[PDB]
Amino acid sequence: MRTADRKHRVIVCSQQSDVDDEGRLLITRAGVIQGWAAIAPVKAIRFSQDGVSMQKDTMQPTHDITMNYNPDVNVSVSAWVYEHRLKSPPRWFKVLSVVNVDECSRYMKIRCRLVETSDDVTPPV
């Protein structure tokens, strides 16, 4: 695709998980890759004041994110995508699958789902 279309700045993050000693569990999202990517919607969104999406299935992707393919990385089941904007509240996406576009190994198309978009998410570390 047009390299002037990759007009979204994202940070691909991996999830590190452990239980707090108090008994509950905690998830950390560490940023691994930073680049430009192009997102596009493939489904409507239910916002539910506070921002968090109201999708019921939680397995149907809602956005498609394409970026530079990278042969040394393995986008696992446990990768997130933190997208930051100028004057719009940041977003968290959860990856649901990847597809190597036409197997030409030039672009990865990440099928992901919008988790939440509100001004008070925890940015990566």
Binding site: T3, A4, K7, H8, R9, R85, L86, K87
Partner: protein
């Protein structure tokens, strides 16, 4: 200095790059620092408010026409000194023009418009446009408009692929451009 003339937020709000930042601010100000070297290199005009200028003139056109390199304001008489001349002369120009009549013969006057001078907003809409066209034409995408009608000659894809003309700039800076 430029960002005082053209704030970065105005660039961004015009070219839709907001809540969707394409190339970062650094590249944006580089684009700006190059879009003032196409504009005002294509117009000939400079960056200073309501200057008064001094210059040597010549008298080609034996009858005696003088061609100035500016536009003297309406009413203020320009003065000619130096060269064969008893004392500085007083010629009142023709409104919105630079043609005059009658040891180096020199002339001085006051250019620009009497009031405040920004940068005639209107030779800025091209600069905004020239920036905009350069944000989503980094240079791998083949876009090319045609100038001539006939063809190239050989199987060449026509051509005007320039920018600043394909963007609507050349024909929005031209209103401040003399046609001789």
């Amino acid at each position: 200095n430029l960002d005082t003339l053209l704030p970065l937020q105005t660039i961004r709000e015009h070219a839709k790059c907001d809540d969707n930042p394409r190339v970062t601010d650094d590249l944006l100000k580089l684009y700006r620092e190059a879009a003032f070297e196409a504009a005002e290199l294509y117009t000939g005009l400079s960056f200073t408010p309501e200057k008064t200028i001094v210059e040597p003139i010549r008298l080609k056109g034996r009858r005696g026409k003088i061609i100035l390199s500016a536009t003297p304001i309406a009413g203020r008489p320009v003065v000619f000194y130096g060269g064969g001349l008893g004392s500085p002369l007083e010629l009142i120009p023709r409104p919105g023009s630079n043609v005059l009549f009658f040891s180096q013969l020199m002339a001085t006057y006051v250019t620009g418009r009497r009031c405040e001078n920004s940068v005639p907003a209107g030779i800025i809409i091209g600069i905004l446009k020239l920036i905009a066209w350069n944000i989503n034409n980094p240079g791998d995408e083949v876009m090319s408009v045609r100038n001539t009608l006939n063809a190239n000659a050989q199987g060449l894809i026509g051509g005007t692929n320039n920018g600043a003309v394909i963007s609507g700039a050349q024909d929005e800076w031209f209103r401040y451009r003399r046609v001789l």
